[PDB]
């Protein structure tokens, strides 16, 4: 994977000694080239993960996330061009360095071989985002935002470290290939429950899970837009990639202690989706929407069925493209109106034709029209959960109905209706943010044509 | 203090510590401590401020008491063994007397209320020399006698250090005070692994030495002593405080910065010894150390603070002092994780 | 080699050259009292170097070519607002005094470097122990509130205790009704706007706090204007003085090592000029300070440390 | 007004002095060049040729081989009077059952 | 009530307050030397005999 790693780190010298105006052009073009090179990673064998090196390996689960990160990186590059114009060149290059460093840690995380190496770069993503959230934020609270996001993830991260090093002393290795191949049943000894626990809350705190999610509304609604997408699109999914990994050994414990988190989640998305319907800030809805969508994933991983894992993977990638779009969409409105209140700028279809479309299928992908990959992930979860328990259907079915309730609500309360006559600064929609939405949406329908590439290794 | 006397005063401190790390006789070890104390008290009160006198004083009574207790614990060991060699202690009371005798020199358990304000009163220069060099000697003694150590006592010494050091730092503004509690926090980390693998505390010592060094001579360059005084450095020196972020993150152990190497490597070793509950604990309570690191990070350059108009001609002038190894120290204090297996060089 | 601890270890001393010829002196005269004429007259005949009164832009002479920098980037204040309208909420008045304070810090600092590295005495126009005279006169005339004034002494005490008073000074005495005529006679339009009570407040503070507390640190040589135009007697008495009373004799080489060490690097000299005390005339906005700090950067030479700015020459940078 | 700070500058619109711009940056010539190159790279070969690459990828998880091999032993089971597929993946004779 | 009143009060604010509350008593030391070394004496005494770390 150094055919991706080496060019990615080579973006640092190139972006750090380019001209004072070419930093945006240079970073965007070669990051896209990295995305094209990363597209070759879509190739997967029947069941053998691509073992490029001793310390790097990939399969049908890592690559779709890998392409998601690499494809994403130019998207914040173009999104940040708007509000980063009024800055010095050296600080601007510092911003680009954080994004590239964030990307580089992401690729190493997904391509990691053993759990400890995965853990190091996994957590290492906290540092670049911590600077992004805090240094370049917009409001006073961002200082409290960073601490909330940092400690929450760390509070669960440290128990996993103790459990991980404990794995090495007991099993003899932490390599994922050996762990799955040398998998042994886990006893129900009272120590083993905490052993199971210490490998879980690390992944579910950043999912986020119901209860342990408050950093999500306190960061995504408050981070800079560029940091907002990568947080929602991929960073939450870091728990997903880990959980499919760590569950290979933590069996058959999952049968019992999934329950306290299952209905914690099962009552979760319905509860969270209710909060989304009754927000006042724009970005607060999508943030609360993200945990709601992430909640069905938690059930998908934990239930441990092949169908749910495919549904987990599809919903994971689909939500990333979606949540990035709505966060980008909110940023476009926030920039002109200098706020994020929902009913502040209702009724803008008459002035924003193309935006009103970009609202339209972005919300529809949030409603998950058929046959968008959102349903393909969502429906697979439903069938797996129903096979587990019939009474499941009412809950998340009601959730995706209250999900439908709000997912038109901002469409009504941002585009439908009459403009505000005192507002007179909604200028012609610039092609930059405009083309940004195009690059968000077309891969969604393109992947809809051939979804078979994003169901993970269980397909 | 005349420059020539200052050098010989320092050389006596280094010789005193060196005598501790090379001698095999208990009396000479005690002598090395005595010479170390004797040559250091003048160093603390180099500038003769009113604060430094009692700062140096609180140093003296604490360490003299520690030295006298150390001498007594040596004497009992001679009484019950007839040996002066540093192998082990053949009287449990003799050992159980030296742990605190060495602890107050290290400042770990409630034998620590001297560390904060002794750092505060004295200058920043001797503050660096106090919190880094003065710990090689007592730790070297502990490493040699690591065999016959009561694990229950030694672990409690460190656990108390981590809790108090982390808790105390949350309520400090004077940068020297927060450094002292942070140093006390690292005291427990090094000493917790002491009974199990002495190679590990040497590694943590070396990393902590670079952390405290690099942090301090950044403070010297910033010429700041309180959080507010540091805040204005963003207006004058942006790179110094921007570098101070990474060292602060590394000092908190936030990986992949070099500061994780001790916290990571230590945890791996004790889990080999079926210690699980305690390693989870310092993993938890290292976070309060991280708190006032980020608050320092927030106040320095993560958020530019109100400046002072008297800074114009300040920008017109550059530092004449020439901190060396500062560009080097940051490198070891930030990015040495890929060379983690090098701990076997110490082994 | 710059004078560091290494030179003292080598044996480099400055007491050997500290003699009767190393007199750092300055003529502390009233406004337009002819003190500059008296100071320069001392300079030519006594062999001492002349330090022109450190203004708002003297620091610009200490750094680089010496051209006065822009007001916003070399003080944020200027003198015309002081004289024309000495009452406003922006507080240009104290911003002048606070900035003008540091100028005489350097003017005395460079005065030290002259006579501790060579032993050759200097002449100035007023000094650090004259800036309070203007500030005290500033408060009595209703210019800037006392919160700035009470901060002034706190800053003054922590940037001058390490500083040793000069060898001698000269106080030229010109009657205050004549000075008001003199400022009116020159024709500088800002001099018209000056209140007459300001000049006598300068005269009062000169003979109320400066002259009394100076007497035990340097000799009193109070000379009238009738005693000032004649350039001889003002300097024969200097030679016929004693230079006995004062802290100069009891400053051994270890004090001089401490002295020159602190004053060699200005950073700690005025480190206490930027006290973390927020004041209306001193607290620049976070955004304002940020851009202004940037604004200082595009200026030539003020990008890297001196000797490295390729924009203003400094060839062979790749080896320097 | 103790904190001497410049007033909040009004946000600039990319189209005031550059109506025909693309909303990328201030200087025009690179603003088109930026637009030309992102509009090139994004929706072109990264998108199009990328789509052909994945769509025309070689055998992905080998399902064509599955069908080809499935038809082979589908015939074999149907030929020699055998069920299409037995109930034991591993032959029950080699597994040595305890007791 | 559930999210913004209880969740942030059931984990973040309680633990933050607990550290907030008793970080004061650790750090509110008046500095009396007699009181410091008195704590040394109690720690020295209870090190053995009472806690029997020597046994």
């Amino acid at each position: 994977m150094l055919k991706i790693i080496i060019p990615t780190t080579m973006l640092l010298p190139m972006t750090w000694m380019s001209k004072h105006n070419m930093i945006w052009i240079n970073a965007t073009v070669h990051s896209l080239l990295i995305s094209l090179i990363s597209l070759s990673l879509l190739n997967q064998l029947g069941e053998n993960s691509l073992n490029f090196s001793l310390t790097f390996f990939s399969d049908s689960l890592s690559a779709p996330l890998l392409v998601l990160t690499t494809w994403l990186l130019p998207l914040m590059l173009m999104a940040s061009q708007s509000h980063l114009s009024k800055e010095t060149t050296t600080r601007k290059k510092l911003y680009i360095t954080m994004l590239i460093l964030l990307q580089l840690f992401l690729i190493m995380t997904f391509t990691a071989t053993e759990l400890i190496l995965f853990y190091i770069l996994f957590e290492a993503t906290l540092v670049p985002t911590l600077i992004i959230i805090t240094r370049w934020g917009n409001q006073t609270e961002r200082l409290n935002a960073g601490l909330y996001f940092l400690f929450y993830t760390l509070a669960g991260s440290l128990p996993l470290l103790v459990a991980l090093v404990y794995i090495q002393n007991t099993t003899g290795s932490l390599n994922f290939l050996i762990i799955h191949y040398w998998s042994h049943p886990l006893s129900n000894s009272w120590s083993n429950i905490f052993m199971w626990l210490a490998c879980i809350m690390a992944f579910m705190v950043k999912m986020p899970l119901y209860g342990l999610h408050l950093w999500l509304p306190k960061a995504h609604v408050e981070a800079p837009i560029a940091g907002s997408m990568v947080l929602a699109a991929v960073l939450l999914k870091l728990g997903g990639y880990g959980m499919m990994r760590i569950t290979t050994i933590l069996n058959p414990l999952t049968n019992y202690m999934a329950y306290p988190f299952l209905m914690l989640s099962m009552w979760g998305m319905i509860m969270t989706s209710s909060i989304c319907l009754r927000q006042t800030d724009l970005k607060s809805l999508i943030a609360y929407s993200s945990v709601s969508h992430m909640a069905l994933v938690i059930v998908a991983i934990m239930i441990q069925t092949p169908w749910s894992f495919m549904g987990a993977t599809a919903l994971m990638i689909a939500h990333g493209l979606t949540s990035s779009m709505l966060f980008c969409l909110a940023n476009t409105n926030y920039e002109r109106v200098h706020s994020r209140t929902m009913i502040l700028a209702r009724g803008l279809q008459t002035l924003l034709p193309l935006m009103a479309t970009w609202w339209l299928m972005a919300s529809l992908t949030n409603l998950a029209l058929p046959p968008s990959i959102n349903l393909i992930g969502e429906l697979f979860i439903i069938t797996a959960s129903f096979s587990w328990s019939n009474i499941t259907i009412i809950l998340m079915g009601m959730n995706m109905m209250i999900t439908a309730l709000y997912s038109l609500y901002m469409l009504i309360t941002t585009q439908r209706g009459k403009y505000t006559h005192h507002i007179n600064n909604i200028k012609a929609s610039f092609t930059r943010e405009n083309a940004l939405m195009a690059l968000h949406i077309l891969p969604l329908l393109l992947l809809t044509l051939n979804p078979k590439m994003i169901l993970g290794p269980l397909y | 203090m005349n420059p020539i006397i200052y050098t010989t005063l320092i050389m006596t401190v280094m010789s005193g510590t060196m005598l501790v790390m090379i001698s095999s006789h208990w009396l000479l070890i005690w002598i090395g401590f005595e010479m170390n104390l004797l040559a250091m008290i003048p160093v603390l009160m180099k500038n003769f401020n009113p604060r430094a006198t009692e700062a140096a004083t609180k140093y003296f009574l604490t360490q003299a008491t520690a030295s006298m207790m150390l001498m007594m614990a040596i004497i009992i060991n001679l009484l019950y063994s007839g040996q002066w060699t540093i192998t082990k202690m053949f009287n449990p009371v003799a050992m159980t007397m030296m742990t605190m005798a060495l602890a107050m020199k290290l400042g770990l358990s409630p034998f620590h209320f001297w560390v904060p304000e002794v750092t505060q009163g004295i200058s920043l220069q001797a503050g660096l020399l106090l919190l880094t060099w003065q710990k090689l000697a007592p730790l070297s003694v502990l490493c040699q006698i690591s065999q016959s150590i009561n694990p229950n006592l030694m672990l409690t010494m460190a656990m108390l250090s981590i809790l108090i050091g982390g808790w105390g730092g949350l309520n400090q503004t004077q940068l020297r005070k927060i450094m002292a509690y942070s140093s006390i926090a690292h005291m427990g980390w090094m000493t917790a692994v002491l009974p199990y693998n002495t190679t590990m505390t040497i590694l943590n010592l070396l990393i902590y030495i670079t952390m405290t060094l690099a942090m301090f001579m950044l403070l010297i360059h910033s010429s700041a002593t309180t959080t507010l005084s540091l805040s204005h450095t963003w207006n004058k020196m942006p790179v110094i405080t921007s570098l101070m972020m990474v060292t602060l993150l590394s000092m908190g152990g936030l990986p992949p910065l070099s500061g994780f190497m001790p916290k990571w490597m230590i945890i791996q070793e004790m889990t080999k010894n079926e210690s699980i509950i305690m390693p989870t604990l310092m993993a938890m309570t290292a976070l309060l150390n991280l708190y006032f690191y980020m608050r320092l990070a927030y106040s320095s350059s993560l958020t530019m603070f109100p400046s002072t108009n008297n800074m114009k001609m300040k920008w017109q002038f550059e530092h004449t002092k020439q901190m060396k190894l500062l560009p080097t120290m940051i490198v070891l204090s930030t990015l040495v994780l890929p060379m983690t297996p090098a701990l076997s060089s110490l082994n | 080699l710059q004078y560091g601890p290494l030179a003292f270890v080598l044996g480099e001393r400055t007491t050997r050259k500290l003699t009767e010829t190393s007199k750092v002196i300055t003529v502390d005269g009233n406004i337009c009292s002819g003190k500059g004429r008296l100071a320069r007259e001392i300079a030519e005949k006594l062999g001492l170097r002349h330090f022109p009164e450190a203004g708002i832009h003297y620091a610009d002479s200490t750094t680089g070519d010496g051209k006065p920098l822009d007001v916003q980037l070399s003080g944020n204040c200027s003198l015309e607002k002081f004289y024309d309208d000495p009452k406003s909420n922006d507080g240009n008045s104290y911003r002048l005094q606070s900035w003008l304070y540091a100028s005489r810090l350097l003017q005395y600092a460079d005065a030290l470097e002259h006579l501790l590295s060579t032993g050759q005495g200097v002449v100035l126009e007023r000094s650090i122990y004259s800036d309070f005279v203007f500030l005290e006169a500033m408060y009595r005339q209703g210019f800037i509130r006392k919160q700035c004034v009470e901060h002034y002494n706190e800053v003054k005490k922590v940037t001058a205790c390490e500083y040793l008073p000069p060898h001698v000074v000269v106080y030229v005495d010109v009657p205050v009704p004549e000075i008001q005529s003199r400022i009116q006679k020159k024709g500088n339009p800002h001099e018209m706007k000056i209140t007459a009570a300001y000049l006598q407040d300068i005269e009062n503070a000169y003979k109320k706090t400066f002259l009394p507390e100076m007497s035990e640190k340097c000799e009193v040589l109070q000379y009238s204007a009738r005693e000032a135009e004649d350039a001889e007697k003002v300097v024969e008495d200097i030679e016929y003085l004693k230079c006995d009373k004062g802290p100069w004799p009891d400053q051994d080489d270890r004090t001089f090592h401490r002295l020159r060490m602190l004053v060699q690097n200005k950073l700690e000299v005025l480190n206490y000029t930027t006290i973390p005390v927020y004041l209306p005339e001193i607290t620049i906005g976070a955004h304002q300070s940020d851009r202004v700090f940037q604004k200082f950067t595009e200026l030539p030479g003020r990008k890297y440390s001196p000797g490295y700015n390729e924009d203003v020459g400094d060839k062979w940078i790749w080896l320097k | 007004i103790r904190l001497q700070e410049d007033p909040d500058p009004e946000d600039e619109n990319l189209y005031e002095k550059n109506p025909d711009s693309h909303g990328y940056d201030k200087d025009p010539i690179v603003d088109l060049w930026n637009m030309r190159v992102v509009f090139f790279f994004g929706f072109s070969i990264v998108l199009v040729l990328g789509s052909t690459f994945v769509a025309y990828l070689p055998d992905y998880r080998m399902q064509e081989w599955a069908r080809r091999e499935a038809e082979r032993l589908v015939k074999y089971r149907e030929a020699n009077g055998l069920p299409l597929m037995e109930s034991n993946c591993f032959d029950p004779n080699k597994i040595q059952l305890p007791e | 009530l559930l999210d913004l009143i209880w969740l942030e009060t059931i984990l973040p604010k309680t633990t933050s307050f607990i550290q907030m509350k008793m970080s004061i008593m650790v750090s509110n030391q008046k500095g009396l030397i007699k009181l410091y070394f008195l704590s040394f004496l109690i720690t020295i005494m209870i090190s053995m005999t009472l806690f029997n770390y020597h046994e």
Partner: peptide
């Protein structure tokens, strides 16, 4: 303009102890 620390934000930890109380009130 993004929010930046102001004077009253600087003074929150500007005391001798940046967590105050009655014991530390003097």
């Amino acid at each position: 303009r993004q929010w930046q620390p102001d004077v009253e934000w600087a003074e929150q930890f500007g005391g001798a102890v940046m967590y105050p109380t009655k014991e530390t009130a003097h």
